Structures are given as structure tokens and as C-alpha cells.
Design a protein around this motif. Structure first.
Motif, mmCIF file in Angstrom:
data_model
loop_
_atom_site.group_PDB
_atom_site.id
_atom_site.type_symbol
_atom_site.label_atom_id
_atom_site.label_comp_id
_atom_site.label_asym_id
_atom_site.label_seq_id
_atom_site.Cartn_x
_atom_site.Cartn_y
_atom_site.Cartn_z
ATOM 1 N N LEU A 13 0.770 -1.277 -0.080
ATOM 2 C CA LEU A 13 -0.097 -0.108 0.101
ATOM 3 C C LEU A 13 0.863 1.225 -0.119
ATOM 4 O O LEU A 13 0.200 2.575 -0.172
ATOM 5 N N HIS A 14 2.154 1.180 -0.011
ATOM 6 C CA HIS A 14 3.062 2.365 0.064
ATOM 7 C C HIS A 14 4.152 1.965 -0.683
ATOM 8 O O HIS A 14 5.206 1.775 -0.015
ATOM 9 N N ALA A 15 4.256 2.368 -1.921
ATOM 10 C CA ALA A 15 5.369 2.205 -2.845
ATOM 11 C C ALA A 15 5.300 3.370 -3.551
ATOM 12 O O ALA A 15 4.473 3.441 -4.467
ATOM 13 N N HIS A 16 6.422 4.237 -3.757
ATOM 14 C CA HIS A 16 6.535 5.254 -4.906
ATOM 15 C C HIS A 16 7.331 4.845 -6.076
ATOM 16 O O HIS A 16 8.425 4.094 -5.934
ATOM 17 N N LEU A 17 6.483 5.176 -7.163
ATOM 18 C CA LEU A 17 7.040 4.477 -8.534
ATOM 19 C C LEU A 17 8.383 4.884 -8.688
ATOM 20 O O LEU A 17 9.453 3.996 -9.037
ATOM 21 N N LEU A 202 -1.858 9.879 4.076
ATOM 22 C CA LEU A 202 -1.039 11.236 4.341
ATOM 23 C C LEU A 202 0.509 10.718 4.853
ATOM 24 O O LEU A 202 0.371 10.032 5.735
ATOM 25 N N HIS A 203 1.434 11.283 3.953
ATOM 26 C CA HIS A 203 2.654 11.089 4.948
ATOM 27 C C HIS A 203 2.773 11.853 5.888
ATOM 28 O O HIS A 203 2.371 13.286 6.214
ATOM 29 N N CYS A 204 2.831 11.338 7.444
ATOM 30 C CA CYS A 204 2.554 12.291 8.654
ATOM 31 C C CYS A 204 3.298 11.904 9.654
ATOM 32 O O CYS A 204 3.712 10.709 9.943
ATOM 33 N N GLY A 225 0.876 7.433 6.614
ATOM 34 C CA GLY A 225 2.367 6.891 6.258
ATOM 35 C C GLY A 225 3.163 7.152 7.304
ATOM 36 O O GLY A 225 3.237 8.370 7.699
ATOM 37 N N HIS A 226 3.735 6.352 8.223
ATOM 38 C CA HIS A 226 4.871 6.561 9.139
ATOM 39 C C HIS A 226 4.810 6.802 10.230
ATOM 40 O O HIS A 226 4.991 5.893 11.551
ATOM 41 N N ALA A 227 4.224 8.009 10.802
ATOM 42 C CA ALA A 227 4.032 8.366 12.095
ATOM 43 C C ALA A 227 5.117 8.195 12.936
ATOM 44 O O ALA A 227 5.091 8.139 14.060
ATOM 45 N N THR A 280 7.296 -0.983 1.657
ATOM 46 C CA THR A 280 8.490 -0.919 0.977
ATOM 47 C C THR A 280 8.992 0.491 1.108
ATOM 48 O O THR A 280 10.154 0.801 1.264
ATOM 49 N N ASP A 281 8.112 1.355 0.864
ATOM 50 C CA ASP A 281 8.316 2.866 0.665
ATOM 51 C C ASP A 281 8.984 3.004 -0.952
ATOM 52 O O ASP A 281 8.523 3.563 -1.698
ATOM 53 N N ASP A 282 10.254 2.730 -0.862
ATOM 54 C CA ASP A 282 10.991 3.143 -1.888
ATOM 55 C C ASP A 282 11.997 1.947 -2.204
ATOM 56 O O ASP A 282 13.295 1.903 -1.548
HETATM 57 ZN ZN ZN Z 1 6.747 7.317 1.388
#
Ligand code: ZN
Ligand code: IMP
Length: 340
Positions: A13-17, A202-204, A225-227, A280-282
Motif C-alpha cells: 500500500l505504500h510504494a513510490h514509482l 498522508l505522509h504524517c 504513512g509512517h507516524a 516498502t516505501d522506496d
Molecule cells: Zn513514502
């Protein structure tokens, strides 16, 4: 154990192209652009291999990546490669997020950038893909607003996302450098997206910012995302609002947002029965994969196979997919449940 994790069906659910590009592709693009003169290959390859990927420093790396990748044919290529790589490690559902780009000198608009992403999805052949409305992978898209943007430009992104609901856009992300921009710039565009039934992530809390963290929580996005830098009052509100957290273990530890996996808040959330999803994020920037993320989590929490399977399956209700897709995912996981 890594073999059983690799074969586990998984939800990303959180992977930037442009954070998920293969090293070989990035360097191939670097070489080509060098031999054309747009840049100096030794310097670019050096920022690729030397960048410490601390927080401040990751964003320098993205400015460089974007000089290598902001062209329609390249957007199409890396979209296909990212989907393939995820499918090959048995991701069965992927929400891919990307910042649509404008570049006047090549006739690229936010819309044409996104049309190139769709072309990438259509070009996927190694695996079967469902993106509209042999491994098989469901893909849906999040358009990212970058914190460098104006309210007007953010609205352009939201309007585009609404137009592209027929090709699998399901929501909006807010991301980019957390030290740049103000929530009040993005709130009006995000509110328009939410009122038009787009889902919001939201990245938060990527850096300490207590008023912003509270304002994002009060907005009640559908995920965050993250917290990383939440305080006690922030956790209390998050748990009562039941907003799922996208957890990015390697990214958080590499950027030194979290000093170690042994103190990472995902353990507190897991024990509190608060919804979390390993992401994974990136995976290109941070040299990981979703299987590796699961392996780190299984080791740190000491999960059994069945606990791990249950956590993986819990992500279904955090997806932004239509109900028919979630039912297919429930079937995929129910079908795999006795082997785990
Ligand atoms: Zn991210
Ligand atoms: O660690 C992160 N924090 C905030 N934004 C990020 C992070 N990782 C990737 N991004 C965003 O994702 C972009 C790269 O993927 P793109 O949107 O496909 O261009 C970057 O330019 C950032 O805005």
C-alpha cells in the motif's frame, strides 16, 4: 523461512514509482543520458552510490532520479518493471503512488505523465494484471501531491485523479519533503478529493511537527504513512480514529527517522491491535523488497506462520479497492490460508 515469506500473498500500500526503480535501469538511463551530454555519468553514478539516504539527503537523490526518469517512454518502462518485480514476489494487490509531473520542454503534462503510467500497465506481459475499474496482480493507483506544490497545482492533481477513476485511480497521497510547505496549502485540495469520494493517505509525522500532526489526524484521512514522530496525544487520537498506519521499516531506519527496529512503533501498534500494513516505501532507493520487510517484522516480533498470515490478510480492509476486488483478495487469502 525467507522462502515461505516470499511465497506469502502480500498487499503493498505504500510504494513510490520513482523510488522503486531497478539499479540496472537507473544506471542504464544514467549512461544513456551521459553519452547524450545531459549530465556527467561519473558524477550521477557517484550520487547514486554515495548518497547516505538520510532524510535531508534522500530528497537530493530524488531530484537526481527525476532528471533521469521524467520522460514518457521512461515512465512507461519503470511502471512495467515495478509491477513485474512486485508480482514476482507474490504481491497480489499493489497501490502504486506517483507524483504526476509537468515538463514543458518535452510536452509532458500531469495528464500525459499519467497516460504513460497507464501505458506501462498495459505493457505488462510477464504476469497477468487487473488495473481497470502465471502470477496475477491487481494494481490501483494513488496520485501524489508533492509538498512543494501550490493549492492550485494540488487541485490539478485531484481533478486528474477523478478523471482517471476508470483506469484504477483510487486515491490521493500527500508526500515530498516534510520540511517544505504548510498543511493549510494542501488541506483544501485534499478536502475536495475526500468530498468526491477519493480515498486519502498522508505522509504524517516524518519529522517532529506537533501542530501539523494534529491537523492531519483531525482531517481523518483513510490511512497515514509512517507516524515516526508522533507524541502520546497523537497516538491516543490515532488509535481512537482507527486510521491504519503504513509501516516502512527499512526506510524509517535508514533515514534515521527511527533509531532501531527494536523500538519501532509497529510493535506497539501490533500489540494494541491497531491496523498496520508493512510497506516498502522506496524499494529501489532503500535496496529492499516487501518479503524482506516481512522478514524483518517476523524476526522482531517473533511471529509464527499463522500470525504472519493473519497480519498479511488484515491489510485487505485497508486497501482503497472496490468491494469486488476485496472479495477476490479474500478468496486469494482464504485459498492460501491452510498452507500457512
Ligand atoms: Zn513514502
Ligand atoms: O520518504 C519519503 N518521504 C516523503 N516523500 C517521499 C518519500 N519517498 C518517496 N517520496 C516521494 O516520492 C517521490 C518519488 O516518486 P514519484 O512520485 O514517482 O516521483 C519523491 O519525489 C517524493 O516526493
Amino acid at each position: 523461512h525467507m522462502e515461505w515469506i516470499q511465497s506469502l500473498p502480500k498487499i503493498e500500500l505504500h510504494a513510490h514509482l520513482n523510488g522503486s526503480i531497478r539499479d540496472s535501469t537507473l544506471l542504464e538511463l544514467a549512461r544513456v543520458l551521459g553519452e547524450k551530454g545531459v549530465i556527467v555519468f561519473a558524477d550521477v553514478e557517484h550520487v547514486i552510490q554515495k548518497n547516505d539516504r538520510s532524510l535531508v539527503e534522500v530528497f537530493k537523490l530524488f531530484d537526481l532520479i527525476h532528471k533521469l526518469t521524467t520522460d514518457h517512454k521512461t515512465v512507461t518502462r519503470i511502471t512495467r518493471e515495478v509491477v513485474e518485480d512486485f508480482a514476482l514476489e507474490n504481491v497480489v494487490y499493489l497501490e502504486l503512488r506517483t507524483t504526476p509531473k509537468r515538463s514543458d520542454s518535452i510536452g509532458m503534462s500531469k495528464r500525459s505523465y499519467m497516460e504513460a503510467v497507464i501505458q506501462g500497465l498495459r505493457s505488462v506481459s510477464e504476469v497477468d494484471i487487473d488495473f481497470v475499474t502465471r502470477k496475477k496482480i491487481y494494481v490501483r493507483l494513488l496520485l501524489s501531491i508533492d509538498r512543494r506544490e501550490t493549492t492550485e497545482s494540488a487541485m490539478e492533481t485531484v481533478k486528474l485523479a477523478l478523471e482517471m477513476r476508470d483506469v484504477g485511480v483510487v486515491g490521493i497521497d500527500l508526500s515530498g519533503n516534510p520540511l517544505v510547505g504548510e498543511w493549510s496549502t494542501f488541506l483544501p485540495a485534499l478536502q475536495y478529493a475526500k468530498d468526491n469520494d477519493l480515498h486519502i493517505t498522508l505522509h504524517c509525522g516524518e519529522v517532529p511537527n506537533p501542530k501539523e500532526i494534529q491537523a492531519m489526524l483531525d482531517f481523518k484521512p483513510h490511512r497515514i504513512g509512517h507516524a515516526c514522530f508522533f507524541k502520546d496525544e497523537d497516538w491516543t487520537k490515532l488509535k481512537s480514529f482507527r486510521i491504519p498506519v503504513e509501516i516502512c521499516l527499512t526506510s524509517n531506519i535508514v533515514t534515521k527517522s527511527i533509531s532501531s527496529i527494536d523500538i519501532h512503533h509497529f510493535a506497539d501498534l501490533y500489540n494494541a491491535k491497531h491496523p498496520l500494513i508493512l510497506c516498502t516505501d522506496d524499494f529501489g532507493v532503500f535496496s529492499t523488497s516487501l518479503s524482506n520487510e516481512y522478514a524483518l517484522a517476523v524476526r522482531s516480533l517473533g511471529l509464527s506462520k499463522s500470525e504472519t498470515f493473519a497480519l498479511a490478510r488484515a491489510a485487505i480492509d485497508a486497501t482503497f479497492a472496490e468491494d469486488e476486488v476485496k472479495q477476490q483478495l479474500r478468496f486469494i487469502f482464504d485459498s492460501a490460508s491452510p498452507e500457512h
